Write a protein that binds this ligand. Structure first.
Ligand SMILES: [Ca+2]
Length: 448
């Protein structure tokens, strides 16, 4: 019949595992800690110029630490460095990467100084590049401190003028120290596009356009590159969508048992409901992937590899790709909105961090805590302490990782801007994780 089973030699976030989440999630093992509203502060140094040219308080969103190759937080001339997306709370979609820094031993949110934007408006036009001149927004990525002691940034070139084209991009951020307590962004170099999709392994924006994606509610992604090394190889792991040959979007995907898991009765009942219902198109178009590419030593593309995992039928959006090695195993994380999901009992207000584990970098990834659930945040977006973009930072010692996230902080009274959420701890033990009891850290804390 139309029924089939193709894994495409890759792992999958299955419907069977997702449907189990609603009855599992209501536990302090997974719940994002409740945060103390009275102590929440804006990032004091998060000031910049608005579109008019007046200095304002910025909203600060997605952030990532400068990391060592293994994912631990780097120390740069005695400083911890955090790259963050920021912009004017009112002027629509305008994100730029800012560089924040803090003396390694300082703890308070007030200790985070602002070195300003990584890029000048003019920077994108300098290199001879296929894509950069078309950039309208700077989206998320990662930062690594190289062997040579260079600050190497990876981020997403978003082009709103090119149908939302997304390109994995790199630059070396040149730094100096004007005095004992200041870091300065001097400028950028080796600023170049790396990858924008191939069509067979990862969806391109052209495929998105050609299929009439803006009319069907399709969501094209090629973003959030996370730098990692393994056995002398350099990689980016990123958010994407499947291409034509590794389980493409469309109605056929609803007949693929690989995306369902469970037994035949589960597959048959779930499939029938999908085909009948108002989620048919949404599920059909859902082909999120966590992709991987290998880089050369100069950070150009070496090899486009098959995805680590996909969320076919489940969601088109698996965000903030994250991966690191712990206790000889590889842990893979991604954030996912309930609103973009097609799962019974998962709703608009549900936000997740999902996690998977493998014995090897490109091996089979199995769900943490049986289902893949690691974190559950379901506070209403209107709540002051709503958090988003949860990201696990591995630590030099111990079994705990630090969870960072941003807190939108839009209360009726001050403080009033998107800020660093209080960080917290998650214990990792084999294929099991748990939120650490009563250990809420400072806003934007990276290390314990
Ligand atoms: Ca899609």
């Amino acid at each position: 019949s139309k029924d089939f089973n193709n894994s495409y030699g890759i792992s999958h976030i299955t419907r069977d595992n997702m449907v189990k989440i609603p009855q599992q999630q209501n536990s302090d093992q997974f719940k994002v800690p409740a945060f103390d509203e009275s102590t929440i502060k804006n990032i004091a140094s998060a000031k910049g110029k608005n579109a008019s040219g007046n200095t304002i308080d910025l909203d600060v969103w997605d952030s990532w630490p400068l990391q060592n190759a293994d994912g631990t937080v780097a120390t740069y001339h005695g400083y911890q460095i955090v790259f963050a997306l920021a912009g004017d709370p009112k002027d629509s979609n305008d994100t730029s990467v800012y560089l924040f820094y803090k003396k390694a031993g300082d703890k308070s949110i007030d200790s985070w100084k602002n070195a300003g934007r990584v890029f000048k408006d003019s920077d994108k036009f300098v290199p001879n590049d296929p894509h950069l001149k078309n950039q309208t927004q700077e989206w998320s990525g990662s930062g690594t401190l190289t062997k040579d002691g260079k600050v190497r940034l990876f981020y997403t070139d978003y082009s709103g003028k090119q149908y939302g084209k997304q390109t994995l991009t790199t630059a070396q951020v040149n730094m100096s120290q004007p005095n004992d307590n200041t870091l300065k962004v001097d400028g950028v170099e080796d600023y170049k596009s790396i990858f924008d999709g191939d069509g067979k392994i990862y969806q391109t924006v052209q495929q998105f356009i050609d299929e009439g994606g803006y009319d069907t509610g399709d969501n094209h992604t090629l973003r959030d590159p996370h730098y990692i090394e393994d056995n002398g190889h350099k990689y980016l792991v990123f958010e994407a969508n499947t291409g034509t040959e590794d389980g493409y979007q469309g109605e056929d995907s609803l007949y693929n048992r690989a995306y369902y898991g469970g037994n035949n009765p589960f597959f048959q009942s779930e499939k029938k409901k999908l085909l009948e219902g108002s989620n048919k198109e949404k599920a059909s178009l859902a082909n999120g992937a966590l992709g991987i590419i290998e880089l050369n030593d100069d950070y150009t593309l070496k090899k486009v590899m098959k995805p680590l995992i996909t969320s076919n039928t489940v969601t088109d959006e698996i965000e903030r790709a994250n991966i690191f090695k712990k206790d000889g195993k590889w842990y893979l994380f991604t954030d996912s909105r309930g609103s973009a999901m097609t799962i019974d009992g998962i709703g608009q207000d549900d936000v997740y961090m999902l996690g998977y584990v493998s014995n090897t970098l490109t091996g089979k990834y199995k769900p943490l805590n049986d289902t893949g659930l690691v974190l559950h945040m379901d506070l209403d977006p209107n709540d002051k302490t709503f958090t988003y973009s949860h990201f696990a930072v591995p630590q030099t010692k111990g079994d705990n990782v630090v969870i960072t996230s941003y807190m939108t902080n839009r209360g009726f009274y001050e403080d009033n801007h998107s800020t660093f959420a209080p960080s917290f701890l998650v214990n990792i033990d084999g294929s099991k994780t748990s939120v650490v009891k009563d250990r809420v850290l400072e806003q934007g804390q990276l290390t314990v």
